[PDB]
Amino acid sequence: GSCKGRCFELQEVGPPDCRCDNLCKSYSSCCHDFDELCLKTARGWECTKDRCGEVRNEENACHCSEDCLSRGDCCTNYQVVCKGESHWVDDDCEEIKVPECPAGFVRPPLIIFSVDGFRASYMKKGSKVMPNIEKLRSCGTHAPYMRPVYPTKTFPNLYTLATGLYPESHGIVGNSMYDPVFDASFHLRGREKFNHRWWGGQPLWITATKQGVRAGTFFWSVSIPHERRILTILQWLSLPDNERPSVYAFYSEQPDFSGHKYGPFGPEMTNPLREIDKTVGQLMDGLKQLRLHRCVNVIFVGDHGMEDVTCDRTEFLSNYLTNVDDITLVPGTLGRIRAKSYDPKTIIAALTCKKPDQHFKPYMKQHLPKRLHYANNRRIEDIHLLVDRRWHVARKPLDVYKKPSGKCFFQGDHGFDNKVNSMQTVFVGYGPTFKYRTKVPPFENIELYNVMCDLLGLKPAPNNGTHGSLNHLLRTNTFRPTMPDEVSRPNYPGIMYLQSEFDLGCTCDDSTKERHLLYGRPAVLYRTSYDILYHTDFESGYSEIFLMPLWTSYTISKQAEVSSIPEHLTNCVRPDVRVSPGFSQNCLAYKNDKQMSYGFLFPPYLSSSPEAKYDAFLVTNMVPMYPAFKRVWAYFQRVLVKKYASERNGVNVISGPIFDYNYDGLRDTEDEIKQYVEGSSIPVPTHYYSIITSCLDFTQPADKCDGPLSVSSFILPHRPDNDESCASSEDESKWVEELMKMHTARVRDIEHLTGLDFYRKTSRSYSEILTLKTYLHTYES
Ligand SMILES: *[C@@H]1O[C@H](CO)[C@@H](O[C@@H]2O[C@H](CO)[C@@H](O[C@@H]3O[C@H](CO[C@H]4O[C@H](CO[C@H]5O[C@H](CO)[C@@H](O)[C@H](O)[C@@H]5O)[C@@H](O)[C@H](O[C@H]5O[C@H](CO)[C@@H](O)[C@H](O)[C@@H]5O[C@H]5O[C@H](CO)[C@@H](O)[C@H](O)[C@@H]5O)[C@@H]4O)[C@@H](O)[C@H](O)[C@@H]3O)[C@H](O)[C@H]2NC(C)=O)[C@H](O)[C@H]1NC(C)=O
Ligand SMILES: C[C@H](CCC(=O)NCCS(=O)(=O)O)[C@H]1CC[C@H]2[C@@H]3[C@@H](O)C[C@@H]4C[C@H](O)CC[C@]4(C)[C@H]3CC[C@]12C
Ligand SMILES: CCCCCCCC/C=C\CCCCCCCC(=O)OC[C@@H](O)COP(=O)(O)O
Ligand SMILES: [Ca+2]
Ligand code: NA
Ligand code: NA
Ligand SMILES: [Zn+2]
């Protein structure tokens, strides 16, 4: 077969017949004359003055002849150089109220322009280096930065962009990975990645195709130059209505390639950024030449940032482990350890707080911060190393490959914790469906799959985005989110039992809703039996199944006083006459459990009076806590809640337990709970959460807030030691806050882990609430 009349055909031809599509090279399937007909390069990609009105020469890469517009193969700058038109970038910003598309366009097309390793801060270089990108950013909708997923590498992040899924769910958990069920390894180099079996979820091109929206072919063989890809996208946009795709992808390997070689701050980065802008220029000039520049939505998006890293800053496992030849390490800016073909507890202990300024921390994957969502996949090794920004971890010094000079290859790298500043990347949306000259807050790249589906009129496949949380990016929204319906309604028990009926082994020395549930009652979204319990200082939703609160809500004013637990109440636990003895915890179980103590969800320390303080010792306010965790919890309750109330002008706090023994980020059922307090059916939480809300305008108190809300949340691991915190032998003021900042979380994360729905009664729109629920308080900003 021949490629004559078929260059970059959108249909693909099955074997044995030869192909002419943009991927044929990658499958060794092109017709003999593909290069000759489809990959013309003569005279480059730009018209010059001397070429204007030339006699057409079919050898040229693109054309500057009078007939080129009608034939559809002009160079992108043809009208500029030969017809006196202006570059798109030199035109004034003008609002696109409505898509201005040629007749027969059913919807505005979407072009996704992805850049690899584009740090958010590169945008500070401005129009002097990147005038086209700067115009898109200024005129369109932009965020200061976009948060990638962990690990902050290309393959996980690009496939998250495509699917809306965390890597643990889509399956591309690294650039490199081993599947023990396949007994095979996936790598950047080689053929294994072309096997469909690695790739889960439903990416945008499949979602589009299944719902009758033409995607064409996203992927390009890497040897086709950038300029040819741009020209081909433009030619596809000129196809007839029954063939023209509605969505296009362009991907650039820059500025990642340069970032690795020169570091993110090297003066050598300027040129690669200029070249990316030149390519954006060609696209926009090219669209303008087709009169599609006010028709198409363009997304300019990065996969991750780039950090300064050097050979000099490498930790070696051979300095900790006596037995490194028995382990396989996925090295670099993260660590994944498994057996060569070895004991996990030994390895973790040998890597835990062994050197004073140790530049990595080992975790069993279930103990990683829940915000990373990096555990529920067989391709994720049990042992994980979180590596400090600017550092590498390697197995042994002679595992590190060198350049001929002896020095390491990289001055830049990425892959670190996705809350690290240097890993943040970019988002700009420009076009008829995006807002005009609008800044939006930072958001996570898991949210974009939904947006792209909305931009194409597609129903998204189930994903980890919160659909509606990015409605404020768009001028017009084809998705209106609705609050989920409550599944279980509470009971409201009154006094039902006499104290004499209780023998729990306990002893003690003898406008609630309005004040303490500021944003309404959380809805329970699964089938269960629970009670609303009111008190002077706090309200709770008490589970009869788990024998403790699902949530506890209370408000602490700026002027609230902290008091001590009187010595005589130290061991006070009181039966709750509203709740059956059989639905209550018992003190005997804690006495007999050598490892387990207990804490309180509402802190006795913040009670409004000595009289009300007795409510805080109710058995229905008690939760199981390891003595090590009580050090953390007690400092949070006695010191930090009041600090936050002073800083934020009051806070509302909702605290509760989380059960996630199978580490899937979702509420466990009873069956899935694997640990109970000794001799009892009191389940042991894997984590404790808190959601701390106040007024965004801190000049207004939390309980009289007219406007937007401000939230910070955490999901603290409920651990029997503080081995995670290397300073834990010191006073809690030296390490507890650091622990908590590491385990910051979104409200949405807590919702997945609890089956609760928060903020059900506010004066805010539901899409603004959805935005609030996806917010992550990072303590870099
Ligand atoms: C983030 O969002 C995710 C998506 O909503 C949430 O994951 C989902 O979690 C639910 C609840 O536990 C799971 O429900 C069980 O599914 C079982 C059915 O098995 C399979 O069917 C799924 C549907 O497949 C059809 O539809 C999709 C459209 O999206 C198409 O892509 C398919 O072609 C097909 O038409 C399928 O999605 C699922 O896929 C996984 O498994 C394969 C291997 O077989 C992997 O290649 C792939 O990467 C997925 O793996 C992930 O999930 C599995 C659990 O299924 C994990 O073991 C694995 O470690 C990895 O995390 C599968 O083949 C059914 O028998 C049960 O009764 C449940 O109904 C969904 O399967 C699951 N979906 C996905 C994509 O993972 C996730 O909870 C959420 N996370 C948070 C924190 O909120
Ligand atoms: C990552 C890769 C592009 C970069 C590159 O390395 N180019 C190859 C040059 S070389 O190695 O031959 O020298 C793309 C190209 C085709 C894609 C594949 C597609 O064809 C077919 C599949 C489509 C599925 O929905 C996703 C998985 C799937 C297997 C794609 C995964 C990603 C694939 C492999
Ligand atoms: C809407 C989605 C956005 C557009 C593209 C989505 C495609 C997602 C699908 C699969 C992931 C890989 C797609 C191929 C792109 C190029 C892959 C590649 O070879 O990247 C260079 C890589 O060595 C750099 O790795 P890093 O060291 O992690 O930067
Ligand atoms: Ca679970
Ligand atoms: Na005990
Ligand atoms: Na410690
Ligand atoms: Zn890279």
Author numbering: 56 to 396, 402 to 570, 590 to 860
Question: What text comes from the article?
Answer:
Autotaxin (ATX) is a secreted lysophospholipase D (lysoPLD) that produces the bioactive lipid lysophosphatidic acid (LPA) from extracellular lysophospholipids, predominantly lysophosphatidylcholine (LPC). Crystal structures of ATX89 (ENPP2) revealed a catalytic domain with a bimetallic active site adjacent to a catalytic threonine. Substrate binding takes place in a shallow hydrophilic groove that accommodates nucleotides as well as the glycerol moiety of lysophospholipids, and in a deep hydrophobic pocket binding the lysophospholipid acyl chain. In addition, the catalytic domain together with the first of two somatomedin-β (SMB) domains, form a tunnel adjacent to the active site.
Crucially, mathematical modelling indicated that TUDCA is a noncompetitive inhibitor, implying that LPC or LPA can co-exist in a ternary complex with ATX. To test this hypothesis, we crystallized a complex of ATX, TUDCA and LPA and we determined a structure of this ternary complex to 1.8 Å resolution. In this complex, TUDCA is well defined in density and the steroid moiety lies in the tunnel, but the conjugated tail is in a single well-defined conformation pointing away from the active site.
